[PDB]
Amino acid sequence: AEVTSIPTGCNALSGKIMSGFDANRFFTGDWYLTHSRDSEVPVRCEKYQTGSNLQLNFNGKNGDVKCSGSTVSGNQGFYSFQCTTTSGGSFTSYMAVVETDYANYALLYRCGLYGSTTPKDNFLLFNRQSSGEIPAGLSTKLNQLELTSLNKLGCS
Numbered sequence: 001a002e003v004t005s006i007p008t009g010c011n012a013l014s015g016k017i018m019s020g021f022d023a024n025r026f027f028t029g030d031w032y033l034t035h036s037r038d039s040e041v042p043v044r045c046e047k048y049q050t051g052s053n054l055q056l057n058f059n060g061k062n063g064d065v066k067c068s069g070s071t072v073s074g075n076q077g078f079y080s081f082q083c084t085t086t087s088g089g090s091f092t093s094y095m096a097v098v099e100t101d102y103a104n105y106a107l108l109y110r111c112g113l114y115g116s117t118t119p120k121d122n123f124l125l126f127n128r129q130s131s132g133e134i135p136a137g138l139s140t141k142l143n144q145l146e147l148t149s150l151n152k153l154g155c156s
């Protein structure tokens, strides 16, 4: 059966997502994951490569990861990505773009179960440049979401 809403425990962020999200402008080019609310060690620099039809590739923890996306019918703005890893792993992950200017930065929410019963989520800051940091345009939004000290990752 089709999965029609994000996992129980994931935040649908009703009322907190940008209006007029343009998938065509977001899912093009490269995005570097430069900061996140929660982070692991050692920090890394993941470059997310996008292609047509919600396909993406990134350099993950242990090998390249390839994902295929689709819209989540019950949750506006959300996507479900089915991913496979070069070590032979597979997982599902959910995301929504909270705010983006398409040409410089994007604040995303990500959530998934990953085989557990308790979801793991995060807020992610993507930048078009590996040297990208926290944009002035997100100041108020980050305050509203209580994201006052994003962790810098391994990009520079």
Ligand SMILES: CCCCC/C=C\C\C=C/C=C/C=C/[C@@H](SC[C@H](N)C(=O)NCC(=O)O)[C@@H](O)CCCC(=O)O
Binding pocket: 031, 036, 048, 056, 059, 060, 061, 062, 065, 067, 081, 083, 085, 089, 091, 093, 094, 095, 110, 111, 114, 120, 121, 122, 126
């Ligand atoms: C343009 C931006 C597009 C964003 C697309 C959104 C989602 C699909 C892409 C990546 C998903 C990664 C999920 C990783 C799982 S861990 C999932 C699994 N255990 C695994 O083997 N992961 C391999 C690996 O992470 O390298 C956890 O590390 C996540 C922890 C919390 C978080 O940061 O979301």
